[PDB]
Amino acid sequence: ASPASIIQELASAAKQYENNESGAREALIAQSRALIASLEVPSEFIQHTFWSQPALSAIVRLATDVNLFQYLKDAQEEGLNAEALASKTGMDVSLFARLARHLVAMNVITSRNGVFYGTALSNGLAAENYQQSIRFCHDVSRPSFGAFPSFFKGNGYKTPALGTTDGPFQSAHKVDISFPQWLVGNPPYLQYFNSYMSAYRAGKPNWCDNGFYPVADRLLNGFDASVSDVLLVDVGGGRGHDIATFGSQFSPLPGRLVLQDREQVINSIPADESRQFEATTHDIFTTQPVKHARAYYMHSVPHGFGDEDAVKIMANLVPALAKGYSRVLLNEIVVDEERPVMSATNMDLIMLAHMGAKERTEADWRSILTRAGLKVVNIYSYPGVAESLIEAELA
Amino acid sequence: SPASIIQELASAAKQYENNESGAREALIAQSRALIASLEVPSEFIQHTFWSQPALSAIVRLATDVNLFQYLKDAQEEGLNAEALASKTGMDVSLFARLARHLVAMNVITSRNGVFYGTALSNGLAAENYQQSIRFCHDVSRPSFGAFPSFFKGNGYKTPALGTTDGPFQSAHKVDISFPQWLVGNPPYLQYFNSYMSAYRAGKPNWCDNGFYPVADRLLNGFDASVSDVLLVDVGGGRGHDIATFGSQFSPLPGRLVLQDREQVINSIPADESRQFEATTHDIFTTQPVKHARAYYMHSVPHGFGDEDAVKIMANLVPALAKGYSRVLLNEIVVDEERPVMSATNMDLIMLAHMGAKERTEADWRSILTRAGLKVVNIYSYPGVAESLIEAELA
């Protein structure tokens, strides 16, 4: 498509965004990027891909070491000049200004008259779960992507056969062990990974938001405490950000919210008597011990595993399901291979870089669920959201 | 506000359809400001730390399996995943997953299971861009990745000497300078020399119409009895910059002389249709070509510290003819009040390779005055990184 027709689509996406139409914000972002690629000459692509973005990753990472975004957030509308920020961060004034000006040029912070100002983006990155996300992404993920050309050249350009132990993660970090086992051995990145899961898709519609999955008519209507006093199980729910979101959307809750994850994750959950869920340890490769609950939910869990493991994860739910009663809710990307979206390719390559795994199409997922003993009732999606919601039941 | 940027984008769009200077670049910048006004922090994290590191890695891998060349030859027929996996020697599934990110990142296009090369991908199939990609992912990328750890360990100090105490040395585990690391790590010297023909390719040159007035300042008043040399390109690489000049102002009234390192000069194809003399010259020694009409440098002293940049320019001074010899310095002039990507890009490229920096107008004036030169005028062009600084004997 020519720039002229992208300019038209961009203006068409604009109106839809002003009219608050769902997904239009992401479509405005998409039309903006297509314009840039339609206008850039090859030398500008090279500078942006290989200079701006690597320097941007490095400076954003460095900012978490010197409290930069926290300082700019605190300054609110007054801002700080390079002399005041260098003093607070303990940095050479000239080095700071050169790194800060790239953040300006990269649209992360702003600057008027030698004063630097925080933005909505940088004030958000000042929160501690984004700070650890940044560290994880530059310290753990970046070496793995950088190893892609030499690793796949060294392995004959093959998909990782075993997955978890023969992927580019092992080669970049020089270990024989899997990504989950590496986290146990390399503090503080397990803490960084666990905080990072409350951030990697935050600020986007949840599966349980209006116009996505119908929680009230499918789960709440027909809830039967005489079958089980448990409303929802989040299997692999991390520190509980998703199940807590659910609790505040649908209170007063008629049944229990049960969180299951690894022992180390569960213990890292700070005590809180306003918390609406129970934090319990459970191995997803063991049979589900919470029986006949109304809903079993999974978000970004089996997409990190091979076919055999993912069928194991799903089939471990089967003994717990009450026929006609228990829903299985799978919150995962559904790849539409005829229409590659960046949100799908992003997570796909992140799976390859960490778990040696991939994102699945609708046909792939149905194969997984059929062999597990389940079958799809409906699939739900939302404009602009990466994940789908797959409702399944006993086959 | 997003709505503000949306209106501003449409304004620059109409100026772009009118073919105005720098409008194409302003449309790109307006589009980037729109993305930043709309993206939530998680979207920025995914694009910065997932999309972009994966994109660089796939584009680098593509230079190992002839991807962009296969898609270029395909032209309008295209190639599906099975056809390209066979041609590249790759697993069909691995290839398809890597190519769909290139599609999602707008580098190639996909329709009904067929992949198509683009103007961008076809150009990247050319060997100087192929070697540019390899240099950037192999040499430049590890230096950037070391910025947090290196500056944390050195106390967040600007490198004190420049070329041997910077992130490049720490990232590549050597105690020698970047140029010497190239001498001892083939073929990255050859990759660097080809890269110097691509890093700013396709953007208007200093000599283009509306940029520097070459004919008025250089051709008019050219005097063979003072010297028969029209322009010396000092540090001009393999001569791409000086070849462009000769083809814009031919029939040339005087000689063109290229100057660079012996290793650069001896790698230039011998060519009868060549319009310039390829000669070896150390920029840290006195300029041996006397009284030429124009002495020109492009992206040369910006790689060096203040003391050495003064020397580089001052070595031109004993050769200049007062009232006749121009000094034309084609370098970025940083506007610290208006930080643009073109300057901050190359500034940190200097830090990551040379331990140096780009300079403001006041910075350059100090170097030229210490070298014994005075600025005549500074020329700039909308959307171009570098300025053209004309100077002369003080």
Ligand SMILES: Nc1ncnc2c1ncn2[C@@H]1O[C@H](CSCC[C@H](N)C(=O)O)[C@@H](O)[C@H]1O
């Ligand atoms: N064998 C296992 N037993 C229990 N939890 C596991 C597990 N293997 C992986 N997990 C958990 O599954 C999660 C995958 S990351 C997804 C986290 C969360 N559902 C979110 O969407 O943000 C991690 O928290 C990880 O700790």
Ligand SMILES: Nc1ncnc2c1ncn2[C@@H]1O[C@H](CSCC[C@H](N)C(=O)O)[C@@H](O)[C@H]1O
């Ligand atoms: N001491 C020296 N003597 C001669 N050339 C030198 C030199 N030190 C650096 N150079 C040259 O300066 C060049 C800087 S890269 C700039 C190349 C070209 N002017 C362009 O803009 O495309 C390199 O080609 C390098 O070989």
Ligand SMILES: C/C(=C\Cc1c(O)c(C)c2c(c1O)C(=O)OC2)CCC(=O)O
């Ligand atoms: C499935 C799994 C990890 C896979 C996984 C994710 O799910 C998500 C959301 C993310 C990453 C990742 O590698 C990542 O790099 O960015 C986000 C288990 C990990 C463990 O058990 O430690």
Ligand SMILES: C/C(=C\Cc1c(O)c(C)c2c(c1O)C(=O)OC2)CCC(=O)O
């Ligand atoms: C001045 C100099 C190198 C500085 C320099 C450049 O000018 C340009 C344009 C570039 C780089 C660079 O490091 C780079 O990494 O990407 C483009 C001399 C090098 C030598 O003598 O080998």
